[PDB]
Design a binder for this molecule. Sequence first.
Ligand SMILES: Cc1c(CN(C)C(=O)CCc2cnc3c(c2)CCC(=O)N3)oc2ccccc12
Ligand SMILES: Cc1c(CN(C)C(=O)CCc2cnc3c(c2)CCC(=O)N3)oc2ccccc12
Ligand SMILES: Cc1c(CN(C)C(=O)CCc2cnc3c(c2)CCC(=O)N3)oc2ccccc12
Ligand SMILES: Cc1c(CN(C)C(=O)CCc2cnc3c(c2)CCC(=O)N3)oc2ccccc12
Lengths: 258, 253, 253, 258
Amino acid sequence: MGFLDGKRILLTGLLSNRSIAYGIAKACKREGAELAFTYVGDRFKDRITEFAAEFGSELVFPCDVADDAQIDALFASLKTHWDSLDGLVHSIGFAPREAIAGDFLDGLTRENFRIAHDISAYSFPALAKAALPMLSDDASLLTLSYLGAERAIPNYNTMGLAKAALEASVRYLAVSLGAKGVRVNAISAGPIKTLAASGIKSFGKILDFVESNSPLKRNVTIEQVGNAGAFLLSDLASGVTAEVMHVDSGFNAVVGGM
Amino acid sequence: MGFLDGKRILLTGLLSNRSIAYGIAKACKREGAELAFTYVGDRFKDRITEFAAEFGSELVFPCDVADDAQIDALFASLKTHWDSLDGLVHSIGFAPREAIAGDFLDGLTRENFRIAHDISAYSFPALAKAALPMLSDDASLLTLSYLGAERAIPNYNTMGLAKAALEASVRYLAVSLGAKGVRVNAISAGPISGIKSFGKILDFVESNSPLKRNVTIEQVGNAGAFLLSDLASGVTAEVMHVDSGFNAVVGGM
Amino acid sequence: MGFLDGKRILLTGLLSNRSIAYGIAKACKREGAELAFTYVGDRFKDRITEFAAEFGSELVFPCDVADDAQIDALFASLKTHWDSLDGLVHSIGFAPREAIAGDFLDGLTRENFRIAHDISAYSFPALAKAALPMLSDDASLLTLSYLGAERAIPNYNTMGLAKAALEASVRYLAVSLGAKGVRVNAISAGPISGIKSFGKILDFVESNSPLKRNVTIEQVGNAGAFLLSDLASGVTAEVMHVDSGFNAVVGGM
Amino acid sequence: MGFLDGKRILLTGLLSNRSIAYGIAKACKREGAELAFTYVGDRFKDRITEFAAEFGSELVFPCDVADDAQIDALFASLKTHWDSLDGLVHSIGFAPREAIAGDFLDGLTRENFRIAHDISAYSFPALAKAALPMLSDDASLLTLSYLGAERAIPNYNTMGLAKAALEASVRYLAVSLGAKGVRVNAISAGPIKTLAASGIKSFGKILDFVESNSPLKRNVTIEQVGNAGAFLLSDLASGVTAEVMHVDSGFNAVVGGM
Ligand SMILES: Cc1c(CN(C)C(=O)CCc2cnc3c(c2)CCC(=O)N3)oc2ccccc12
Ligand SMILES: Cc1c(CN(C)C(=O)CCc2cnc3c(c2)CCC(=O)N3)oc2ccccc12
Ligand SMILES: Cc1c(CN(C)C(=O)CCc2cnc3c(c2)CCC(=O)N3)oc2ccccc12
Ligand SMILES: Cc1c(CN(C)C(=O)CCc2cnc3c(c2)CCC(=O)N3)oc2ccccc12
């Protein structure tokens, strides 16, 4: 009797047990969703398969969002298992490292900019468009953003631009798809420690500053982000579209550190 | 089973079966909350008692939020039934009628400004402060707001000012109460009857919103039950739109 | 041939040569404006008179903005000197001291809230309304705000709420006054003595703002002059940050 | 005498006396600045040369912002004439036609997305980066954006995403350059009628709606946008950076049509 009962939700970005996508998956499964997952590259298939099985699913598909054919095949393959799709979680972002270390301009090149946007902003509406023919009439699309879209956070740099584009795509997609009853949202999550953050030099300080300065005085968890994800993907949030929802212990709403 | 199981929640602002507080009350009860209600004066005692009965409740209290003594006596009477409070819903908003019709300037007075801000903004942190001694560490406080806080809406007038104050109090409250663990949020609900100019708004929203429909008290209620629950434990200092996407477009062009 | 040539501008809140109001007067005077000034209290009359002479003006008027009849008298008297008014600077902000120190709830009382809103928010549209019969069609109204309207700042507390309502009154005034052609804006000024928490803010802004300096009353004065002039004739309902970009960052990490 | 006396300012995007760049050039020249101009394509050399002559200038340089070599050579050429640069006006934006007509997903393709963001967003911080070694200690860089960055506007589509990134780049540029005294802002101009807008099928409808609903009940003029631009470029605005200033008759701040 969970609030996502019988719902069919496809999740991208589940790379480890630290992943935001892992949190959303746990929360969706708890609430009775049926889940499917995507992965990048042939060799990653046992790993996503093991995660999927621990959520009662054997539904896993390759998708490198850089590649048009993989985006089309993804949904073509999903359709042989699922007649329609109720939920879509887009939890992917990447810019070449040098575009997010040090100075914004030192790390800016046309190629760095192009890649960060292609992968971190473009992919979301491209997934939506590819999904559209099989979306149910009350489907819900969710993307992951971060406060750096709204305000300049030190080495976030080129990713800030691409997150701002992604949030705008949340508004444009809502208008497009809403005519079909489909909802589109983002969660602007607080920082979360993953393996990929080990190469981010200021990450420890960000975590420290957020713990010390957010209203709840704690970093957020993938359980919290997960549960908010599940709500936005459910019928409980049918009044809600085009929204950027902060799940960040309130951090965005303060001027910390003074 | 339900996501508000055993949660004890106090609702202010219930006036009819079409109130947002009614939608929130319905959704909270379905998810397993125990409910309490306020009313403003013996004139509304009977309506409100009867709504509480519908939700299996007998905890109904007078509270005119112009009155500090009534605010304090509320939680003193509440404390005789409940050791601690998990949730507060603020759904009270008022300005004298002339302050929300016609032109902003022409109908503005200090009195009307005073009352609007007193009833519609001050009263939320005031309930919050009077509640604090009995608030559980992971309590959740929810106010209701409107897009007129953010952008100028014809005839919303002094209410737009008072709702902006309301949304800033959400932020200062979250900072103040947060170390304890208490969360503070609003829903910026779309419109939900029968005034002429209301009609025109309802039509414009239905036409122009991303989802091409007005929101319901069911939808607002569910989003509220969510913010009042532990599912929302990551979320505080948020003004969440529940409007069909309307805030997010430039309609009508 | 300065950009406010011939323009007649009334300024409130001039208290010292360290006032934002003093910066705006000075820039306005450099660009060719004629100035008038309000003050509060017969103890202050000679200082405002002295300030006003420094700017080539002998027009000073009493106006306690808490008092309706002084607001009306203000423009009754100004009218005996100027046929029409081109600019208005609203630079008054007050909350009782406890309401801007320490915890938000601790310093929250109805009286503290009522007063902070009455003086800091209500008084802006109130002046606008009283001035309307004598405003030129291309008049420009300017208020001062601060970032605590937007996001919770540590001691700003009650005043955060009043500034939020102030920024909304800017938008509603823009709609209410714009057909005639009047423009209404705010500057959200960064900090510019006394407080130890203040030195803390000053240092934080200086370290973290994109321009790595605090703003001055010259910088806020030049921006005010611009918004008061025909150069800004396209700009209304705006809250312009003059804060070295501070609002635009997450500092301290 | 003028509030931009002795300032040397380079302006892109001047196509005709209807361009926003033309408004800004004219205000700037009135206030005492010396000007230089970019143009795209040799077919346009003559026109832009007459505009520059009209502004008492003969400094015109070719610059397709799609092309790194041209961006680099622009500043190399500019340097043979000017010691330093005090102003930069970025007034350029483009997405393929289909990406700005009709439904957002309809004209969404990877290449349309790439072109829109490359020309409309990337080109701003790239000009700033190429300009950096000659920027004066109080230089001011100014870009033009539009309300479509903030809320979804009906055919604005891919260009809303590009303007959102551009607005985020204002903030990143402002942190990156700001320690050396350099200011960075956008003007979010209300719609302005050029030969390009026509059409753009909805443009007359937008113009009518902005006129009926804006606080000032009128569309903005290039003179108004030009004067605000002139201000941001001056020492009058030396307290102002990382700002997106609306010059749109207050239109952004209302809910129109109800
Ligand atoms: C927070 C935060 C994050 C996490 N986050 C919210 C993000 O949105 C993305 C982080 C990210 C994006 N792309 C890459 C990497 C990290 C690492 C290695 C790589 O090749 N590409 O990353 C930051 C980078 C700099 C500053 C802050 C942050
Ligand atoms: C929407 C909308 C609403 C609903 N809403 C979101 C509100 O926030 C408050 C509405 C409201 C506040 N105070 C009073 C009344 C209505 C009616 C009678 C009375 O004596 N006082 O009211 C409007 C009034 C004018 C314009 C728009 C709206
Ligand atoms: C900056 C900053 C300021 C300046 N600012 C932008 C303000 O808006 C200050 C407003 C203010 C309001 N009420 C009073 C006082 C100042 C002084 C003395 C008094 O009795 N009442 O004030 C703060 C108060 C707390 C935290 C930061 C700040
Ligand atoms: C206003 C408004 C404008 C003006 N504006 C603010 C813009 O940013 C326009 C941008 C634009 C981008 N790409 C192209 C064109 C214009 C014309 C011709 C072409 O081939 N490509 O354009 C719109 C497009 C759709 C909806 C509204 C608007």
